Paper text:
Type 1 pili expressed by uropathogenic Escherichia coli (UPEC) are tipped by an adhesin, FimH, that binds mannosylated glycoproteins, including those on the surface of bladder epithelial cells to facilitate attachment to and invasion of bladder superficial facet cells. Assembly of type 1 pili is facilitated by the FimC periplasmic chaperone and FimD outer-membrane (OM) usher in an ATP-independent manner. At the usher, the Nte on an incoming subunit displaces the chaperone’s G1 β-strand and completes the subunit fold of the preceding subunit in a canonical (antiparallel) and energetically favored manner, termed donor-strand exchange (DSE). X-ray and cryoelectron microscopy (cryo-EM) structures of FimD–FimCFGH demonstrate large coordinated movements of the five usher domains involved in catalyzing DSE interactions between neighboring subunits and extrusion of the growing fiber. These structures also show that the two-domain adhesin FimH, which consists of the lectin (FimHL) and pilin (FimHP) domains, adopts an elongated (“relaxed”) or bent (“tense”) configuration prior to and after secretion to the extracellular surface, respectively.
Here, we report the cryo-EM structure of a quaternary complex FimD–FimCFH, in which the FimH adhesin is in a previously unseen location within the pore of the FimD usher during transport. The FimD–FimCH structure had a reported overall resolution of ~3.5 Å and was essentially identical to that published previously, while the FimD–FimCFH structure, at ~4.0 Å resolution, revealed a previously unreported assembly intermediate enabled by DSE between FimH and FimF. Unlike the previously determined initiation and elongation structures, this complex reveals FimH positioned halfway in the usher pore. Remarkably, during this stage in secretion, FimH adopts a third “relaxed-stretched” conformation involving both an elongation and rotation between its pilin and lectin domains. Thus, we termed this conformation “relaxed-stretched. This conformation is adopted by FimH as it spans the entire OM while retaining contact with both the periplasmic and extracellular spaces. In this model, FimH is linked to FimF through DSE between FimH and FimF. The chaperone–subunit complex FimC–FimF makes contacts with both the CTDs and N-terminal tail of the usher FimD. With the engagement of only two pilin subunits (FimH and FimF), the FimHP domain is partially inserted into the TD pore as FimF, having undergone DSE with FimHP, remains bound to the chaperone FimC and held by the usher NTD and CTDs in the periplasmic space. In contrast, the pilin domain FimHP undergoes substantial reorientation (a rotation of 84°) to be compatible with its residency in the TD pore. During secretion, FimH is obligated to adopt a third, “relaxed-stretched” conformation, in which the two domains are maximally apart from each other.
Author numbering:
A (entry chain H): 1 to 279
B (entry chain D): 2 to 187, 196 to 452, 474 to 804, 808 to 833
C (entry chain F): 1 to 154
D (entry chain C): 1 to 205
């Protein structure tokens, strides 16, 4: 029995080793299904199909890399389903034709619940399958070591989540005033997350942000941000807890604060940036 | 309360219409229909029937005893409240001393003032259950569609497609949800979840029937199908969810108490003489210790420090949380068997910041008990220890007994130092098996069970901005010697706006051999401080990202990109980056990715091009949600659980404020994509963007939705014209302040001067009635049809 | 910079809050009846009416104080009382500043002079009253007078 | 008694309404406020409309009067018009105490409302830069060629200090310059919001 691949690599009689590269799905989210079709990669034929019948089956299969670290699943062979990575001998396949035929082997791999980042790196071996070939004419047995590798990188969708109302404004009522600002953040994948505020400051404590108005700024007053009735200094990560599909409210309120001496009038304006930090 | 008409004008006749404003102007009608504001705080608006009696206006507005109790009044604090029947009128004027009630028909204000003694103490931010709106009877669908056209050097004819559908119903208080997925490759269906949920408000619990998952706080989070009754902290008040020690104190007199932390005030109040216990302090977490300062009237001050530390498995004093789940077990793997299991977990709080918790798990082939105590040591920190006993049986029908012990430690050393986050140690014996491994197969990763697990988390602060995160996980096994290791370190800094982050990760799996290292650096530079404030710059909000990676094995990867917005209201976002890879496996080239996603009033749409050395794929995706209710079917952005149905018949293209392009649909309806659960939600429309011929009655609405519910936000609009009428009577101007009411609509106005009257929301033609004393005129006015184009209309009409 | 919040809002310089002090008449036709001449009145309606300006603003420097009301037919420089059955004929109210200088009633805006004001501190302005008449007999009874003082800001 | 929110209220052309705060301090009394707009010449022209033209107030809380636009674009576009907004406050009295003879005054406050046409040439902040002065034999004439209404005060020419005056755009305002006045003249202008801009010195044209 002689086995060949799409490339120049081939398995001669008496067994041997060969490497085959397969391009898998490049985009797969959480709970997605990955299919690796080894049938369209290796074709085997019988050396003496006229009188010798070959029995070819997958003896064992070992997963390598992210396939054994960030995925699992099943292996389909002639309709039979076995584990992946495999631990049992696959069903025997009878080959008695001179013409080469595809190997009826495929892999259905699903990522683990901790999927994230590049699941399988391109240019690295994905699995190694050792197949035992036997014939009824004699007791000769051959071992074929097929190294299935990946040519295109596959990155599981970790999940990039944005904040509602980018570039959102608010207005204070008069000098004595207080206004909550609407800012809700949601993420499709539950994870720990925090937010910290940045901007220009006025005092040493980094509490009151400076007034950067252009049309006669009112000196002696600035804008403060409070969460749950508490002053939030700039550059101070605040734990938002575990945020899931249901959006959580940041719960920030805009207030006034005193910076200098005499209080002028006419305009205040402060630019505040917010930035998220994961873990 | 009499006003001299000579002040208003020098004319001897002047106007008698000031007589309506001289006294309290009591409304003769019983149905006041005025919003009630108790203790200067608005509660709700409803039709209130006023009964004749000894009142300031002569009519006492009848209020239900249950309604008063829900508003904040205490039945026990006022004598005679329990004696009166539920349907009997509550005489707050007589039964409650120093109670003032006033009605204003013009302002539609029901001003109620009651003493603070009659009101019971409540936690900050408490919302009465009455204001919680269960929702409306409506369907809901959410569709997401993604597609790929990846092309490679060999076999590049590939086209993948994913279609996720989420259906749901909100019949009454019951909520039903279902999920489905379609996968297309170059047409296999799939099924994920079916479930229903109900909120038991009196028990403050949730009942879930169908598929679901249990909390992983005590036992491993597992996926089940059956009935779950769980207590949630969402229904609790905002200032009472989490862990916060109860503070007791002795006050000599009417003193002022201030508790602060991290150099900032966290709470303050006034305390009458005697003993006071406070438990409304917010869940600080691990910010640091608390400082309590009490200032007496005489000036004496007492200051003391109370430690603060919270392990995740802690509860507030005098609080309980339970979770029971019963039914079949669905692992997600077709090989695993599906048995029946019943799990019940409970956590309870004891004074001096103690917690006790216990969990039971029963099945046909599994029996597990767990009992643990979480003690808040204080200055040292907080620690929780639990011990679990299991009597399991492997698929080979062999019984196995096992024990496990878990230690969790937390501390808050932010007082001139760094505060650790979690130190966890789990130790299991040779025969302790979790519920997952019991049903692997009928008649395998069960060869080795977890023996020792160590988790370490450290957060260090350098300067004001520099932060260092350290995480470490170490896992052993019984029999074998391979150890799983996961280490992560990270430095985060920011000079003014530029963000620097440097990460170093080490990974060593159990079955795999060889440790893998990953050192990455990322720099973010916003293109805002480098440019002046120009309205039409078109380059604002853009930023550049620099990423560098190193596997330490000889592979270099670099990425440089710019991202920003290119639309008027930031409805569009673009991000273009170019990469460069070399070494390692040998593959090298110039990577590139250009993505563009637009969020609109119909549905999000994203298009992305990726170019590499030999791989190129095109992402095209569209996502959107649809809501079906009694009034019709409205499209919109993907509805994220709680959603508010903005209703405004009359405003066609009105835009919701403080939202990313959420515009009203063609009929005027709209759906808010993200809404906060169990909290006050404010919805406001930009009146500037509203039609010039339509004026909104109110531009701000408040709604408090429950989770998984749809809440209507009413917004009434008037499409009438604004008119400046010059009414004359007997060839003379009308008196000052004569009240004019339109018969066609509900509009009304007051005479300004020289017989001029301003009316809003008036039709092209119609009749009005103006009265000042004891209906003097009934006038009519017809205008040309072309007057609708004009913003303002001025005309004159007499009376008979 | 995932999202930027632009806080905005103006602060306005508040004006001066003024509350007039009601002037009560308690002559009871004592001096007016004794005179019975009405040539220069009887100075019965004499009182130090005080107007308190507090709390004022930060930029309020100078304001204009004027008077206006119903001018007496008999004397153009005096304000007549409100006509009534019990109204005292031959009696009208006249006002003068702290320097005992009569302030014309219903005077033009440009006629009045600027009055200084201490910024940021409470202030009180005291003006004297007097009774005037030209030719009429005293009728005693109640006396009602209506007048308004204009506080023109800068 | 009644405190006005702002001493100066501005009105830009093309806008619909403007808001003015009114607060009460004498919580023990009830004050009724009526508002009206008046032309510079003194006539009661109804070119501006106040939506709550007359209403009472009890206790101590703040209300927001509203000003509309009813000019129909019938005003010059090269100059900002001037109007007077008047708020008249009338107090209350006890019914029993009304028998006793007494005289009660009324609170009326006047403020300047500027109707500013859109598309202004000179910058509103930089409008104070332009100023011209002419010294006569016994008087001083100030002329402001800028298309803005400039209010000047603290006019101190030398040791003597001239009385404050208001100048109109495209015109000259004359004041009585003292005989013993100095050469240099110091003036302080008032901006739109009411803040006191720093002092500046000018030269004769």
């Amino acid at each position: 029995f002689a086995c060949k691949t799409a490339n120049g690599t081939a398995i001669p009689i008496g067994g041997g080793s060969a490497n085959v590269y397969v391009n898998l799905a490049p985009v797969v989210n959480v709970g997605q299904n990955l299919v690796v079709d080894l049938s369209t990669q290796i074709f085997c034929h019988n050396d003496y199909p006229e009188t010798i019948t070959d029995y070819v089956t997958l003896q064992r299969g070992s997963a390598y890399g992210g396939v054994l670290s960030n995925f699992s699943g099943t292996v389909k062979y002639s309709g039979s389903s076995y584990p992946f990575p495999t631990t049992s001998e696959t069903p025997r396949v009878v080959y008695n034709s001179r013409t080469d035929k595809p190997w009826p082997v495929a892999l259905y791999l699903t990522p683990v619940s901790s999927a994230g980042g590049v699941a399988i790196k391109a240019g690295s071996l994905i699995a190694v399958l050792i197949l035992r070939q036997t014939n009824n004419y004699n007791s000769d047995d051959f071992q074929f070591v097929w190294n299935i590798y990946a040519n295109n990188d596959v990155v599981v969708p970790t999940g990039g989540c944005d904040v509602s109302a980018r570039d959102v404004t608010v207005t204070l009522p008069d000098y004595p005033g207080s206004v909550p600002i609407p800012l809700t953040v949601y993420c499709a994948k539950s994870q720990n997350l925090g937010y910290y505020l940045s901007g220009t400051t006025a005092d040493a404590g980094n509490s009151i942000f400076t007034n950067t108005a252009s049309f006669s700024p009112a000196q002696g007053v600035g804008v403060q941000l409070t969460r749950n009735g508490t002053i939030i200094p700039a550059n101070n990560t605040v734990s938002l807890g575990a945020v899931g599909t249901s959006a959580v409210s940041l719960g920030l309120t805009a207030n006034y604060a005193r910076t200098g001496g005499q209080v002028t009038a006419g305009n205040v304006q402060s630019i505040i940036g917010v930035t998220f930090v994961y873990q | 309360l009499y006003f001299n008409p000579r002040f208003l004008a020098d004319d001897p006749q002047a106007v008698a219409d000031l007589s309506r404003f001289e006294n309290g102007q009591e409304l003769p009608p019983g149905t006041y229909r005025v919003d009630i504001y108790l203790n200067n705080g608005y509660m709700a608006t409803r039709d209130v029937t006023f009964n004749t009696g000894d009142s300031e206006q002569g009519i006492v507005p009848c209020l239900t005893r249950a309604q008063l109790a829900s508003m904040g009044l205490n039945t026990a604090s006022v004598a005679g409240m329990n004696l009166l029947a539920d349907d009997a009128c509550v005489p707050l004027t007589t039964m409650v001393q120093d109670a003032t009630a006033h009605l204003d028909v013009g302002q539609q204000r029901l001003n109620l003032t009651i003493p603070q003694a009659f009101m019971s103490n409540r936690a900050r931010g408490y919302i009465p259950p009455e204001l919680w709106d269960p929702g409306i009877n409506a369907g809901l669908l959410n569709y997401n569609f993604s597609g790929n056209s990846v092309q490679n050097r060999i076999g590049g004819n590939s086209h993948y497609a994913y279609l996720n559908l989420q259906s749901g119903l909100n019949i009454g208080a019951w909520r039903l949800r279902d999920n489905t997925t379609w996968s297309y490759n170059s047409n296999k269906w799939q099924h994920i979840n079916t479930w229903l949920e109900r909120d038991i408000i009196p028990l403050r619990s949730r009942l879930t029937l169908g598929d679901g998952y249990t909390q992983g706080d005590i036992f491993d989070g597992i996926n089940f199908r059956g009935a779950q009754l769980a207590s949630d902290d969402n229904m609790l008040p905002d200032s009472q969810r989490g862990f916060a020690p109860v503070i007791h104190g002795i006050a000599r007199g009417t003193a002022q108490v201030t508790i602060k932390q991290n150099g900032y005030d966290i709470y303050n109040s006034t305390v009458p003489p005697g003993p006071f216990t406070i438990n409304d302090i917010y869940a600080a977490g691990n910010s640091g210790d608390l400082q309590v300062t009490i200032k007496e009237a005489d000036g004496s001050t007492q200051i003391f420090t109370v430690p603060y530390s919270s392990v995740p498995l802690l509860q507030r004093e005098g609080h309980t949380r339970y979770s029971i789940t019963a039914g079949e077990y669905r692992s997600g793997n077709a090989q695993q068997e599906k048995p029946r299991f019943f799990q019940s977990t409970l956590l309870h709080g004891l004074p001096a910041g103690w917690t006790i918790y216990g969990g039971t798990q029963l099945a046909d082939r599994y029996r597990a008990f767990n009992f643990g105590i979480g003690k808040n040591m204080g200055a040292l920190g907080a620690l929780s220890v639990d011990m679990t006993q299991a009597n399991s049986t492997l698929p080979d029908d062999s019984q196995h007994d096992g024990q496990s012990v878990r230690f969790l430690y937390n501390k808050s050393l932010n007082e001139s130092g760094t505060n650790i986050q979690l130190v966890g140690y789990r130790y299991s014996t040779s025969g302790y098996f979790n519920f997952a491994d019991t049903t692997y197969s009928r008649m395998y990763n069960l060869a080795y069970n977890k023996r020792g697990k160590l988790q370490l988390t450290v957060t260090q602060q350098l300067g004001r901005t520099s932060t260092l995160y350290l995480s470490g996980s170490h896992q052993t096994y019984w029999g074998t010697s391979n150890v799983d290791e996961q280490f992560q370190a990270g430095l985060n800094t920011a000079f003014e706006d530029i963000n620097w982050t440097l990460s170093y990760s080490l990974t060593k799996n159990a079955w795999q051999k060889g440790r893998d290292q990953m050192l990455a650096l990322n720099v973010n530079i916003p293109f805002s401080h480098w440019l002046r404030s120009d309205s039409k710059s078109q380059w604002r909000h853009a930023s550049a990202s620099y990423s560098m990676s190193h596997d330490l094995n000889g592979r270099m990867t670099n990425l440089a990109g710019v991202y920003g917005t290119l639309l008027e209201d930031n409805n569009l976002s673009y991000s273009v980056q170019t990469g460069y890879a070399g070494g390692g496996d040998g593959n090298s080239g110039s990577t590139g990715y250009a993505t563009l996603n637009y969020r609109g009033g119909y549905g999000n749409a994203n298009i992305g091009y990726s170019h590499s050395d030999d791989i190129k794929q095109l992402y095209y995706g569209v996502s959107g949600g649809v809501l079906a209710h009694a009034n019709g079917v409205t499209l919109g952005q993907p509805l994220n659980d709680t959603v508010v149905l903005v209703k405004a018949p009359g405003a066609k293209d009105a835009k919701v404020e403080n939202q990313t392009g959420v515009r009203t649909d063609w009929r005027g309806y709209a759906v808010l994509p993200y809404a906060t659960e169990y909290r006050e939600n404010r919805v406001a429309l930009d009146t500037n963007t509203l039609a010039d011929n339509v004026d909104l009655d109110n531009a701000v609405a408040n709604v408090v939705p429950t989770r998984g519910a749809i809440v209507r936000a009413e917004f009434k609009a008037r499409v009438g014209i604004k008119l400046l009428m010059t009414l004359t009577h007997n060839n003379k101007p009308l008196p000052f302040g004569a009240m004019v009411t339109s018969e066609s609509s509900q509009s009304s106005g007051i005479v300004a001067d020289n017989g001029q009257v301003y009316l809003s929301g008036m039709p092209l033609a119609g009749k009005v009635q103006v009265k000042w004393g004891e209906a003097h005129c009934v006038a009519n006015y017809q205008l040309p049809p072309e007057s609708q184009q004009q913003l303002l209309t001025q005309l004159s009409a007499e009376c008979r | 910079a995932d999202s930027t919040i632009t806080i905005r809002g103006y602060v306005r310089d508040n004006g001066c809050s003024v509350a007039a002090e009601s002037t009560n008449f308690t002559v009871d036709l004592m001096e007016n009846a004794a005179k019975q001449f009405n040539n220069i009145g009887a100075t019965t309606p004499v009182v130090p009416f005080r107007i308190l300006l507090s709390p004022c603003g930060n930029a309020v420097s100078a304001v204009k104080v004027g008077f206006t009301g119903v001018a007496d037919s008999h004397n153009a420089n005096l304000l007549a009382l409100e006509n009534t059955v019990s109204a005292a004929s031959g009696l009208g109210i006249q006002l003068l500043n702290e320097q005992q200088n009569q302030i014309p009633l219903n005077a033009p805006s440009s006629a009045l002079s600027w009055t200084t004001l201490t910024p940021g501190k409470p202030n009180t302005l005291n003006f004297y009253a007097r009774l005037m008449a030209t030719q009429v007999p005293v009728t005693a009874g109640h006396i009602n007078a209506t007048a308004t003082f204009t506080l023109e800001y800068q | 008694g009644v405190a006005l929110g702002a001493t100066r209220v501005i009105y830009p052309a093309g806008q619909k309404q403007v808001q003015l705060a009114v607060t009460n301090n004498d919580e023990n009394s009830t004050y009724l406020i009526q508002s009206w707009v008046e032309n510079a010449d003194g006539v009661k022209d109804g070119r501006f409309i106040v939506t709550p033209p007359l209403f009472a107030m009890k206790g101590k809380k703040e209300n927001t009067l509203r000003i509309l636009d009813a000019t129909n674009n019938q005003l010059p576009q090269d100059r900002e018009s001037l109007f007077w907004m008047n708020v008249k406050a009338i107090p209350s009295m006890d019914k029993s105490k009304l028998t006793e003879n007494t005289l009660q005054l009324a609170i009326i406050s006047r403020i300047k409302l500027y109707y500013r046409p859109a598309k202004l040439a000179l910058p509103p902040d930089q409008a104070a830069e332009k100023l011209r002065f002419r010294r006569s034999a016994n008087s001083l004439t100030l002329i402001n060629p800028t298309p803005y209404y400039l209010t000047v005060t603290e006019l101190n020419a030398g040791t003597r200090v001239l009385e404050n005056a208001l100048v109109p755009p495209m015109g000259e305002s004359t004041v009585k310059l003292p005989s013993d006045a100095g050469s240099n003249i110091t003036y302080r202008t008032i901006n739109d919001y009411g803040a006191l801009t720093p002092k500046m010195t000018g030269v004769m044209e």
